Amino acid sequence: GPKRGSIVKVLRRESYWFNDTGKVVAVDQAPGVRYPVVVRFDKVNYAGVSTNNYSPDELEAA
Amino acid sequence: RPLWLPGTTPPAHLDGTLAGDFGFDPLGLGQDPQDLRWYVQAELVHSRFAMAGVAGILFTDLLRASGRTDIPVWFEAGATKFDFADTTTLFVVQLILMGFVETKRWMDIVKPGSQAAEDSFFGFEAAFEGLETGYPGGPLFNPLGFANDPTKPQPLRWKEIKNGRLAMVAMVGFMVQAYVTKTGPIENLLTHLSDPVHNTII
Amino acid sequence: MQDVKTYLSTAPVLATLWFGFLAGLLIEINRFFPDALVLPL
Amino acid sequence: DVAGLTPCKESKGFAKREKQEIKKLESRLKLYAPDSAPALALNATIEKTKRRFAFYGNEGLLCGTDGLPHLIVDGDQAHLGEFVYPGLVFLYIAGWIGWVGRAYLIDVRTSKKPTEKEIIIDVPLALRIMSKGLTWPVAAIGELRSGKLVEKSANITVS
Amino acid sequence: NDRPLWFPGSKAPEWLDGSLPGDFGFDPLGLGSDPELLKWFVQAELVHCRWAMLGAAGIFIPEALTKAGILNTPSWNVAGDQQYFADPTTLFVIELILFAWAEGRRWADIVNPGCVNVDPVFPNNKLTGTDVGYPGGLWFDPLGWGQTKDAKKLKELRTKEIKNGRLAMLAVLGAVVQANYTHTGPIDNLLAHLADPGHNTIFALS
Ligand SMILES: CC(/C=C/C=C(C)/C=C/[C@@]12O[C@]1(C)C[C@@H](O)CC2(C)C)=C\C=C\C=C(C)\C=C\C=C(C)\C=C\[C@@]12O[C@]1(C)C[C@@H](O)CC2(C)C
Ligand SMILES: CC(/C=C/C=C(C)/C=C/[C@@]12O[C@]1(C)C[C@@H](O)CC2(C)C)=C\C=C\C=C(C)\C=C\C=C(C)\C=C\[C@@]12O[C@]1(C)C[C@@H](O)CC2(C)C
């Protein structure tokens, strides 16, 4: 998917970080992974976590 | 160059070559390009109008103190004086007149082509200024051709606003004094020179 | 001394200092300009 | 005049609202000696009452059928000292507070630990911004004209 | 490294080293821990001791000359309730106007050392000071004293000055307190004390 350390903006409609930016950590390049991109945000959600994984077609704005 | 405070720390949005520059922008008022290219013109027109107001306020009270005419005081001239026409009519006429000039100045500020005249005067009726900012020219504005050269009008262009700022603070002083002393400004100055250490702010 | 300044830079201390200064200001104004209902300007 | 209220310096019901209070204060006063702290305090209170009642009549407020001032918050030029004149200075102060707070937030947000700079204020920067916040209208309108006032990529989501 | 302290046997704190004059290692509360505040507090104390020297010389000497049957100036307490050509508020406004300039130039010297040294009207006078707090120059140092060997004539003079200034501060604070405890002049206190040092003291009232 996208490059490491790239700043991407989310499009997942049911995400706490929708329309927010975050820097990729490490996208897994396995053959059958459905949500390989891993992005960490600088603001926790209602549960307190700041890292989440998306699919490459689910978030991109650069 | 000298600045307003010797512990300079000069700002970046204004560096040099501007007429009357002393690096005085502590409140970061004009930091954007539009802000500076607009505030220069604002200060210009303000300085000029305040200089005209000073020249219309001093002379009158001065000659009236020295006994030359019987004109009323500055804070009394426009104040309820039936002189030639209804005051409101004159206000409306002044607005309608100043519209056709402030619109031209605005046009030249935003898109700097307005020199050509109108009403079949497309020919030998061009205003020959071509300056960097709102400095007009031509016999209608600069008849004697005094603004001769660029890169050395800085003395005169400096003198203009260095007098206009003084005129502005002088006008504010006139207003506040004639509001709190209920008296003429040169009368205030004379009563001050009577005994300075007793005629101060209340 | 640096940590003392940091502690004085806390939220409750700055809050109480600000509100106390404001209370003093308003109290002095009302002791000198009392019963102000209409602005005389 | 307006709204069927008479001016207060002619209201025959204000005289009673003054003299009754005065007489109550004097009844309180007659329980001490004229050279004791209670008597001095009560005389000060009476002088304050007189100074208060001799200011409303001179200002121009309109009293009611019960002898009490009534504020005409209408825009009436003869009554600008009741709502719009103090309202303008209040709006000035409140815009000052809001603008300097917004600017402090904007400046802090671009730092290392922005959440740390909100429980532990940095007094130099805050003071700088409070100082510069005197000409806030000339700055708010300038930020509006320059398109720097609002965002467009807000993070609201609803599935 | 050898120097006397305000408390024999103690150890001088780390932020104090006797480099700056008047240093005796006295800082229990640690009020001068970081240098950013020390370079400010030294100027504070310097201006303070100089003003206190001026005030003590203005309070104690005229009082003695009044009691010595020579002068007739009133007491230092009520020097405000006198007859001058202008109200105290006008004189205070003039004082503030005149002091804004001087104290602002001093402030600019403290903040940015040396940024303000040349005469802004006749740009050739060029005050000769080098260290903040000791501005030098013909105006503030006519007799040339002050530019000497690096130490033992400069540092010695500066510490001999701060030693006098602290005493002056204590003295003027004491005069202020005495003028409220015993409603007499500061020299009358000394006279009454020397008249009977056994029974005439602070305990002679309550
Ligand atoms: C133009 C002006 C006055 C013009 C007066 C006129 C025409 C008078 C006309 C009349 O008299 C006549 C002719 C005849 C009378 O019969 C009629 C009237 C009508 C009465 C005043 C300007 C007055 C302008 C003034 C006083 C401006 C002062 C500005 C100051 C002090 C500093 C401002 C700052 O912008 C900086 C420099 C840096 C920022 O960072 C900080 C801030 C503060 C924002
Ligand atoms: C400046 C000063 C005096 C100035 C005098 C002036 C202007 C004279 C004024 C007058 O002439 C006029 C105007 C009019 C005259 O008619 C009358 C008067 C009124 C007399 C005194 C300072 C007086 C200041 C004094 C006495 C300060 C003492 C401070 C001490 C001992 C502090 C110690 C510590 O701070 C350290 C050192 C380290 C910390 O770790 C520990 C602690 C303890 C906190």
B128 a known binding residue?
Answer: no
- The answer to whether D123 contacts C40, with C-beta atoms less than 8 Å apart, is no
Q: Exposed, middle or buried, B96 (CB in 10 Å: 0-12/13-18/19+)? A: exposed
Nearest to D129 by CA among D102, D149, D150, D147: D102
With beta carbons less than 8 A apart as the criterion, state whether C1 and E34 touch.
Answer: yes
Beta bridge partners of A53: A38
**For chains C and E, what is the number of CB pairs under 8 angstroms?**
8
Instruction: Find which of A8, A20, A44, A45 to mutate to test the D interface (most D CBs within 10 Å of its CB).
Output: A20
Contact with chain C for residue D143, Cβ under 8 A: no
B182 a known binding residue?
Answer: no
C19 φ/ψ sector (left φ>0, alpha ψ -120 to 50, else beta): alpha
- The answer to whether C40 contacts D59, with C-beta atoms less than 8 Å apart, is yes
φ, ψ of residue D7 in degrees (nearest 5): -60, 150
With beta carbons less than 8 A apart as the criterion, state whether A25 and A17 touch.
Answer: no
With beta carbons less than 8 A apart as the criterion, state whether D138 and D101 touch.
Answer: no
- The answer to whether D155 contacts A20, with C-beta atoms less than 8 Å apart, is yes
Is residue B23 included in any domain, yes or no? no
Q: Out of A16, A17, A19, name the one closest to residue D153 (CB).
A: A19
With beta carbons less than 8 A apart as the criterion, state whether B147 and B137 touch.
Answer: yes
Residues 6 or more apart whose CB falls under 8 angstroms from that of B36 comprise B13, B14, B30
What 8-state DSSP symbol labels residue A2? P
Hey, how many other C-beta atoms are within 10 angstroms of the C-beta on A51?
11
Paired tokens of B5: 């405070």
In whole angstroms, how far apart are CA D90 and each of C34, C41, D97?
Answer: 18, 14, 11
Instruction: Give the whole-angstrom CA distance, residue D154 versus residue A21.
Output: 11
B57 in contact with ligand 1, CB cutoff 6 A: yes
The arrangement of strands across the sheet holding A37-40 comes to: A7-9, A21-24, A37-40, A51-54
Is residue B44 included in any domain, yes or no? yes
Instruction: Give the whole-angstrom CA distance, residue A47 versus residue A17.
Output: 13
Nearest to E186 by CA among E199, E171, E198: E171
Give distance in angstroms: CA of B168 to centre of ligand 1: 4
What 8-state DSSP symbol labels residue B32? S
What is the position in ligand 1's atom list of the atom closest to the CA of B49? 7
Residue D118 CA, chain-centre distance (Å), reads 29
Nearest to D107 by CA among D135, D132, D85: D132
With beta carbons less than 8 A apart as the criterion, state whether E70 and E81 touch.
Answer: no
| Nearest Cα residue in chain C from E38 | C1
Residues 6 or more apart whose CB falls under 8 angstroms from that of D93 comprise none
In whole angstroms, how far apart are CA B111 and each of B31, B38, B114, B125, B180?
Answer: 22, 13, 8, 20, 44
Domain range summary for chain C, segments of one domain joined by +: 1-41
Overall resolution, Å:
3.2
Ligand 2: residues whose CB is within 6 Å? Answer: E 27-29, 31, 48, 51-52, 55, 58-59, 76, 79, 169-170, 172-173
* Beta strand ranges found along D13-115 (DSSP E): 62-63, 69-70
Residues 6 or more apart whose CB falls under 8 angstroms from that of A54 comprise A10, A12, A35, A37, A39
| Nearest Cα residue in chain D from A21 | D155
CA atoms within 13 A on the CB side of D17: 19
Q: Which residue is listed with tokens 């499009």?
A: A11
With beta carbons less than 8 A apart as the criterion, state whether A2 and A24 touch.
Answer: yes
Pairing of strands A37-40, A51-54: antiparallel
CATH number, residue B145: 1.10.3460.10
Which three-class secondary structure state does DSSP give residue B129?
coil
Q: How many domains does chain B have?
A: 1
Buried b (16+ CB within 10 A) or exposed e, B5-43: bbeeebeeebeeebbbbebebeeeebeeeebeebbbbeb
B94 a known binding residue?
Answer: no
Residues 12-41 of A with CB under 8 A from D: 13-20
Give distance in angstroms: CA of B171 to centre of ligand 1: 6
Q: What is the span of the domain harbouring residue B114?
A: 33-198
Instruction: Give the whole-angstrom CA distance, residue D139 versus residue D136.
Output: 5
**Chain E interface, Cβ < 8 Å to B:** 85-86, 90, 93, 104-105, 108, 111-112, 115-116, 120
Buried b (16+ CB within 10 A) or exposed e, A24-50: beebeeeeeeeebbbbebeeeeeeeee
Beta bridge partners of A39: A24, A52
Pairing of strands D62-63, D6-7: antiparallel
- The answer to whether C40 contacts D81, with C-beta atoms less than 8 Å apart, is yes
Residues 6 or more apart whose CB falls under 8 angstroms from that of A21 comprise A7, A8, A9, A10, A41, A61
**Shortest Cα distance, chain C CAs vs residue D58, angstroms:** 10
Choose which residue among E54, E59, E60, E162 to substitute to test ligand 2 binding: the one with the highest number of ligand atoms within 8 A of its C-beta.
Answer: E59
With beta carbons less than 8 A apart as the criterion, state whether E169 and E53 touch.
Answer: no
**Shortest Cα distance, chain E CAs vs residue C2, angstroms:** 7
Query: Chain D partners of A62 at a C-beta cutoff of 8 Å?
Result: none
**Shortest Cα distance, chain C CAs vs residue D57, angstroms:** 11
Query: Chain E partners of B202 at a C-beta cutoff of 8 Å?
Result: none
Give distance in angstroms: CA of D150 to centre of ligand 2: 54
Beta bridge partners of A23: A7, A40
Instruction: Give the whole-angstrom CA distance, residue D87 versus residue D92.
Output: 9
Instruction: Specify whether domain E35-195 bears CATH 1.10.3460.10.
Output: yes
Buried b (16+ CB within 10 A) or exposed e, B116-129: eeeeeeeeeeebee
Instruction: Give the whole-angstrom CA distance, residue B60 versus residue B65.
Output: 9
